[PDB]
């Protein structure tokens, strides 16, 4: 059944990223309360809802608002107080619960981020360059027309060869299935998570709705967003694959597969353990149909590989854990020059490429802080001590990655931080009704 008011929920909460994809991220500041309210009234016609999210849509526009954004809009103090504390503090201010330290410390963040300047994040997704522009010109026009707001930054994304990300992996394969979305999960995508884990106003896994913003028109059919921008050091990554390829029989593509858990083509190593299977990788009805019940030792998908860290499935962990409450919906967008596998100079790390991530969840701040602190930058849950995620963890050359083989558990060292945080924000992705309410304040 459809249990979700799809016509009130923003499209981005349920729509997969288009294939191929083009778009733009835009960070906006509200100079005056009335400027903010007006921008929303002008954008609101162009914010698509999640109606028939399984159908084709050549472009849609998303909007998500920071605490500072809500404050400036004039949201009353008793409504501001109903948002979680983490959201109030903002992402930079919560760096300690995110292990955003070292290279990722907020003092190094790119300009708009981490300062409270970002009030409104606008994202345009599109499947061809023509509808990207059509929606872009519409966005730019309404911005120009709104005195009282200024566009802080703007960056285009997508147009990647074969849609691969900034390290050449097929991304956007595994996202949680939502009970009540109207669509049965792809094989191996189950189980359908209770809808209140991802949309406010609805029961979660524990049977009751999560704490949500007040009044009901502001919080219902909304959700929370963790937006993070990374810079990718593909030079360092490439040199790492070459240096350590001896440990996977000279095959650098197998080593790239062991660090993520999937070949760059998308095939998971549980379904393609010895050689790539690019047709498997491209097929949504095949590329996710697996668990780890027959791989308890990480011989196929290593325990500390990226996808297995982020979604352990039936892996035995240290402490009891309901994986269902630690899921996140991801929208990844690669930006910058396309990834090149032969490029391994030091200067390749200086090419401005990377990823934007929009992580969506009714408790997005909690789950992002949880994943960052417990499953990316530690390995106690998998019994590998201080090993950290090879793709996005804050690496130290003397930390290791354990690559299980026959009959020896090989250890690798000398990793650099391959994806460096350039900034981020905790945002609130409001319902279509809540957006209208915000535009009619005061
Ligand atoms: C920063 C650079 C990152 C890169 C290059 C990257 C890349 C990937 C790739 C290639 C996959 C496999 C494709 C797929 O399963 O859809 C994946 C899966 C996943 N990643 Fe990341 N990712 C990054 C950051 C993050 C972060 C910060 C998080 C969470 C805090 C995250 C959470 C996940 C999850 C939940 C999955 C799905 C696992 C599953 O259901 O099997 N990723 N990522
Ligand atoms: Mg949307
Ligand atoms: Mg490259
Ligand atoms: Mg960059």
Residue numbers in the entry: 19 to 460
Verbatim from the authors:
Dye-decolorizing peroxidases (DyPs) are heme proteins with distinct structural properties and substrate specificities compared to classical peroxidases. Here, we demonstrate that DyP from the extremely radiation-resistant bacterium Deinococcus radiodurans is, like some other homologues, inactive at physiological pH. Structurally, DyP-type peroxidases also differ from the classical peroxidases. In contrast with the α-helix rich structures of the latter, DyPs are organized in two domains with a ferredoxin-like fold of four anti-parallel β-sheets surrounded by α-helices. A sequence analysis of DrDyP compared to four characterized and structurally determined members of the class V peroxidase family of DyPs, demonstrates that the proximal His heme ligand, and the four residues that are proposed to form the hydrogen peroxide binding pocket within this family of DyPs are conserved in DrDyP (H324, D189, R348, L373 and F375).
To gain more insight into the function of DyP from D. radiodurans, both DrDyP and DrDyPM190G were crystallized and structurally determined to 2.20 and 1.53 Å resolution, respectively. DrDyP possesses one and DrDyPM190G possesses two molecules in the asymmetric unit, respectively. The final model of DrDyP (residue 19–460) contains one heme molecule, two glycerols, three Magnesium ions and 45 waters. In total, DrDyP contain 12 α-helices and 10 β-strands, with the β-sheets located mainly in the interior of the protein and the α-helices on the surface of the protein. A superimposition of the two structures demonstrates that they are almost identical with an RMSD value of 0.28. The assumed catalytic residue in both structures (Asp189 and Arg248) and the axial His324 are well-aligned relative to the heme. Interestingly, we could observe one hydroxyl group and one water molecule within the hydrogen bonding distance to the iron and the catalytic Asp189 and Arg248 on the distal side of the heme for DrDyPM190. This was not observed for the DrDyP structure and can most likely be explained with the lower resolution of this structure. DrDyP is inactive at physiological pH, due to the fact that the heme adopts 6cLS state at pH 7.5, as shown using the resonance Raman experiments. Like BsDyP, DrDyP’s reduction potential is in the moderately high range, which along with the high amount of the catalytically inactive 6cLS heme iron may explain its poor performance as a peroxidase.
